[PDB]
From Swiss-Prot, chain B:
Role of this protein: AcrA-AcrB-AcrZ-TolC is a drug efflux protein complex with broad substrate specificity that uses the proton motive force to export substrates. (Microbial infection) Involved in contact-dependent growth inhibition (CDI), acts downstream of BamA, the receptor for CDI. Its role in CDI is independent of the AcrA-AcrB-TolC efflux pump complex.
Parts forming coiled coils: none
Native organism taxonomy: Bacteria, Pseudomonadati, Pseudomonadota, Gammaproteobacteria, Enterobacterales
Name this polypeptide is given: Multidrug efflux pump subunit AcrB
Similarity annotation: Belongs to the resistance-nodulation-cell division (RND) (TC 2.A.6) family.
Gene: acrB
Assembly behavior: Homotrimer, with large domains that extend into the periplasm, interacts with AcrA and TolC. AcrA may be required to stably link this protein and TolC. Interacts with AcrZ. Part of the AcrA-AcrB-AcrZ-TolC efflux pump.
Expression induction: Positively regulated by MarA, Rob and SoxS transcriptional regulators (at protein level).
Protein species of origin: Escherichia coli (strain K12)
Effect of inactivating the gene: Loss of susceptibility to contact-dependent growth inhibition (CDI); inhibiting cells still contact the target.
Protein location: Cell inner membrane
Length: 1022, 50
């Protein structure tokens, strides 16, 4: 076609303008987020039962609920937690791209039929259903740095005057408060209470009647009387709205006009609804608000508006309520965007610098400078065409590819500056002939690069989604390019197209070169070996080279994990947090910007026992030396926190994609598969655990991710004694209930806001198995009766956290592979070890292990089919079932050298490596096709030298390669390959391409012109 | 028997949550004396009502 286009180039700028327009407007329609969505869609199911425990939750609620997740569509598997604090999560991951909105329906929708069987304590707290993400966009924090407001106070505000305000802002796909909102507290004491013969119940059943909301008709409305006039609305009883009115509740009255008020039997005051998770920001009372993306909005965009809205409203409410930002995934994104953009921009500067040094010109270097931004822009419109988005993955997608289009450009405008040179004609007739000798090659290598690329985007699950990111990016760029280099370039270099230390130091090294390559080709199969080494070499390096997904990076933050033992205590846990806080602020004072610490958020349960402390460092800048980086600061910490009392305190850097498949580790789940109680499974679990320590061969750290039985204090109502005295089994339980774990009466309104009303014993009368003796119940005949009278107490163990995989009591263990061996082969062991447990016990693999198992290994099976299409395609580029062979044998060259990510640096086969390892095999076989083209072409058209051509071929070729291969490496060499911060993947992408690219050229200059020779002569031979 | 009462009790609440939903242009509710409430969400044209 281009020949018809070189003729009207006037048009092949309209084609170029459109594209640019589309790609420009597409830029704006692009959402921007750190990563895309790559976890399969899960759905948690939470639930409460104030003061329960695992059995009393697993059997009142998590079961039941779970006997009903039947009906729901595409479900992968379903686990569930039941811990000792009334909580029940019940997430349900679902097949790859099922519609999340529609799965959450049904899941939820189908809950709706179990509620009838949930107990009334729970259906009041309500079971919510939502989409599993627990860590996203930014997390504003609201502290007070002048001890006026407490946790609960600050929460409230944040709830009452700003939570929704954000919540509805272009983005804000969901808010999640970091505390409560006030609630009417009503802390009784058996004493002041037993003195009036009233129990909790009496209190409960008063806060009801007294604080409720009645009904009372209009006046007219419903059928009235003839000729009436006033209709008005009657306003009967309506909820109390204060600790005042609450204080005053007629609880008792006895022959004295005795006025026993709720105010006596206990003590009233606003407070928080839950009280068992202490948030505080750098030793200050705090009550943050986390904010998730938006689905299709813009990480940058919306962060800014959140910052807007927050601004504007901070001019409010006394005592400094200073808004902090202990986490914002945005700076990190913007700095990536800011790089890459330079990587591209600069990558071009390179093609201007390089190329000059080669084509005495200027109006020549102007061509690839008008082709690149044309090809980039415009792929930005194919991204918007497939709904894709501007995210880390998608960006490096074009950088890993910067070198494939750039090339393409150079390749054309440098054949014309040869043809109108090697006794050529003018610009026109040059192009025509030039752009027409690479014409069909420029195509064909299209179809080729489409394979050895397409194949990705066919992979597994959590991953493979990533891979897709890369695949369509490249192929969309790549092919989009090949299309301008058949339309705008062939009309752009025609029409435009007309130091001693070079030219006068090249025209002769070429000659030395081709000459050097000249001969050394008689014994053809000279270097047929040597090469065979190379291949064999790779086949070594590969195995040797470790594996990963995404190299971890320094980001704004990281965390410390505290874990006081067995049954510790919030208070005992705080101090540990205060240290953690300390040995961070003040001993790391030029890096820790803040620590946000909370106790109650363990990572393997909750309870006064564990807490965790999220620390936010200072800007990558003020953090210069490698010693001032995360993968460094945590080292100190981790250690510096060993040498601590009974308080395991870890620290560690979060992974690339928080919400995704972590370590190359495994996730194993031991299933109850029959009768076998907790115990039996435990003995079972313990069998296998111990069994696998005896095997650090296949490495390990096999660890139950869950909680050992702890001891627990066991009441026990004597039914009979209950009956004998006048004492209701119900009345007992509410009193003991309410007292100790507290009950949630009903609601009331407080400054225009409905808010719960709880009522439970002061803390003083509920700390120790004694105290139980303080509690009295009113019996039939009207005499208070103490526990001992109708109940006995024993210690015992039980589980504070009962976990269970699809339907069935389970226990989850995780662990690594082997510093030597593969995640894969390490699972297999774990499985044989499973193979011999007691009979009852079954085993099943979830999680990362689920995919890894299912799909996993396909790299072979897929690229088989590419290497076939590559052949097929390639064969008919030429016209033989053999010649294409001379194009293939390039693959190994580029691979080795690319694999000296092993022997040169200290890296791993991680994704960013493999994508590059593909980008690299494209220029490599591209080079091949051309050299094997000009190989025949003048061998076939001018019947030239069976070997004479080959030499000439490579001759008219050493400059294209040397040209491109230069601007590339240098282009990839910058911060790409030598970096400080917001990087990781920068080292990733470069290093891979950086080497391998070396070998791809500096080693194919000799082989490829071989190869072609070693063949094209093995076929129709004698 | 419920001035405001309804709104701020049922209205505000159901409203608090109507956030997230894609393609939303404007929300508008009218809390009523009779105790009746009517939240209303309306999406960008094209959007898929189911
Ligand atoms: C760890 N998670 C991110 C945080 C971080 C900081 C916090 O300050 C908080 C949380 C969890 C949330 C959960 C919420 C929950 N809900 C939204 C009312 C909740 O059910 C409880 C509960 N266990 O009763 C809380 O303690 C809780 O009120 C709470 O105080 C939190 C809180 O203070």
């Amino acid at each position: 076609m281009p020949n018809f286009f070189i003729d009207r180039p006037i048009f092949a700028w309209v084609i170029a303008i459109i594209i640019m327009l589309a790609g420009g407007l597409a830029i704006l329609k692009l959402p921007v987020a750190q990563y895309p969505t790559i976890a399969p869609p899960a759905v948690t199911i939470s639930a409460s039962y104030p003061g329960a425990d695992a059995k009393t939750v697993q059997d009142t609620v998590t079961q039941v609920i779970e006997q009903n997740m039947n009906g729901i569509d595409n479900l992968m598997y379903m686990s569930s937690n039941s811990d000792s604090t009334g909580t029940v999560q019940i997430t349900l991951t679902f097949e790859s791209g099922t519609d999340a909105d529609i799965a959450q329906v049904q899941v939820q929708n189908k809950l709706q039929l179990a509620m009838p069987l949930l107990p009334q304590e729970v259906q009041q707290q309500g079971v919510s259903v939502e989409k599993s993400s627990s860590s996203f966009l930014m997390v504003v924090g609201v502290i007070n740095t002048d001890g006026t407001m407490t946790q609960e106070d600050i929460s409230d505000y944040v709830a009452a005057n700003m939570k929704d305000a954000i919540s509805r802002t272009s983005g804000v796909g969901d808010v999640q408060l970091f505390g409560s909102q006030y609630a009417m507290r009503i802390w009784m004491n058996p004493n002041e209470l037993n003195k009036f013969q009233l129990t909790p119940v009496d209190v409960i059943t008063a806060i009801k009647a007294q604080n409720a909301q009645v009904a009372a008709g209009q006046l007219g409305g419903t059928p009235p009387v003839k000729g009436q006039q006033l209709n008005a609305s009657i306003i009967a009883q309506t909820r109390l709205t204060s600790t005042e009115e609450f204080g005053k509740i007629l609880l008792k009255v006895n022959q004295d006009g005795s006025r026993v008020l709720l105010r006596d039997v206990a003590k009233i005051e606003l407070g928080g609804e839950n009280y068992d998770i202490i948030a505080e920001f750098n030793g200050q009372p705090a009550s943050g608000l986390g904010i998730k993306l938006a689905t299709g909005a813009n990480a940058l965009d919306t962060a800014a508006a959140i910052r807007a809205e927050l601004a504007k409203m901070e001019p409010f409410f006394p005592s400094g309520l200073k808004i902090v930002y202990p986490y914002d995934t945005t700076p990190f994104v913007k700095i990536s965007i800011h790089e890459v953009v330079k990587t591209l921009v600069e990558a071009i500067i390179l093609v201007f610098l390089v190329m000059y040094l080669f084509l005495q010109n200027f109006r020549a270097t102007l061509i690839p400078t008008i082709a690149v931004p044309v090809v980039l822009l415009g792929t930005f419109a194919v991204l918007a065409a497939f709904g894709f988005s501007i995210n880390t993955l998608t960006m490096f997608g074009m950088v890993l590819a910067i070198g494939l289009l750039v090339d393409d450009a150079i390749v054309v405008v440098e054949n014309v500056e040869r043809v109108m040179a090697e006794e050529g004609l003018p610009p026109k007739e040059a192009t025509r002939k030039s752009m027409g000798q690479i014409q069909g090659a420029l195509v064909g290598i299209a179809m080729v690069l489409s394979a050895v690329f397409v194949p990705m985007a066919f992979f597994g699950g959590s991953t493979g989604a990533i891979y897709r990111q890369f695949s369509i990016t490249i192929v969309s760029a790549m092919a989009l390019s090949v299309l301008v280099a058949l339309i705008l370039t062939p009309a752009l270099c025609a029409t435009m197209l007309k130091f001693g230390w070079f030219n006068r130091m090249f025209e002769k090294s070429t000659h030395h070169y081709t000459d050097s390559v000249g001969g050394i080709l008689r014994s053809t199969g000279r270097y047929l070996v040597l090469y065979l080494i190379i291949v064999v070499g790779m086949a070594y390096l590969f195995v040797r080279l470790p594996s990963s997904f995404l190299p971890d990076e320094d980001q704004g933050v990281f965390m410390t994990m505290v874990q006081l033992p067995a049954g510790a205590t919030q208070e005992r846990t705080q101090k540990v947090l205060n240290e953690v806080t300390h040995y961070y602020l003040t001993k790391e004072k030029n890096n820790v910007e803040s620590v946000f610490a909370v106790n109650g958020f363990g990572f393997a349960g909750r309870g006064q026992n564990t807490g965790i402390a999220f620390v936010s460092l200072k800007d990558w800048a003020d953090r210069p030396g490698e010693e001032n980086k995360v993968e460094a600061i945590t080292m100190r910490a981790t250690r510096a926190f060993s040498q601590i009392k009974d308080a395991m305190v870890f620290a560690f850097n979060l992974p690339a994609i928080v919400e995704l498949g972590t370590a190359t580790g495994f996730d194993f789940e031991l299933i109850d598969q029959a009768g076998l109680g907790h115990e039996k499974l435990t003995q079972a679990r313990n069998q296998l655990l111990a069994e696998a320590a005896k095997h650090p061969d296949m490495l390990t750290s096999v660890r139950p991710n869950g909680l050992e039985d702890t001891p627990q204090f066991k009441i026990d109502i004597d039914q009979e004694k209950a009956q004998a005295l006048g004492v209701s089994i119900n009345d007992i339980n509410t009193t003991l209930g309410a007292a100790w774990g507290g009950s949630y009466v009903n609601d009331f309104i407080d400054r225009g806001r409905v808010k719960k009303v709880y009522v439970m014993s002061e803390a003083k009368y509920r700390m120790l198995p004694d105290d139980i003796g303080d509690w009295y119940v009113r019996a039939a005949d009207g005499q208070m009766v103490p526990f001992s009278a109708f109940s006995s107490s024993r210690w015992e163990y039980g589980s504070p956290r009962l976990e269970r995989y699809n339907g069935l009591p389970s226990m989850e263990i995780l662990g690594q592979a082997a510093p030597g061996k593969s995640t894969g082969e390490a699972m297999e062991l774990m499985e044989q070890l499973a193979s011999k447990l007691p009979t009852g016990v079954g085993y099943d693999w979830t999680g990362m292990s689920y995919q890894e198992r299912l799909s996993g290994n396909q790299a072979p099976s897929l690229y088989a089919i590419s290497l076939i299409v590559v052949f097929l395609c390639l064969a008919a580029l030429y016209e033989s079932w053999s010649i294409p062979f001379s194009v293939m044998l390039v693959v190994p060259l580029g691979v080795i050298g690319a694999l000296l990510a092993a022997t040169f640096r200290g890296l791993t086969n991680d994704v960013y490596f493999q994508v590059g390892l593909l980008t690299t095999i494209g220029l490599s076989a591209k080079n091949a096709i051309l050299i094997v083209e000009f190989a025949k072409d003048l061998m076939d058209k001018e019947g030239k030298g069976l070997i004479e051509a080959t030499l000439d071929a490579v001759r008219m070729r050493l400059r294209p390669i040397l040209m491109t291969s230069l601007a590339f490496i240098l282009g990839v060499m910058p911060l790409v390959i030598s970096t400080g911060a917001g990087s990781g993947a920068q080292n990733a992408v470069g290093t891979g391409v950086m080497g391998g690219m070396v070998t791809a050229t500096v080693l194919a200059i000799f082989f490829v012109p071989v190869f072609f020779v070693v063949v094209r002569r093995r076929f129709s031979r004698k």
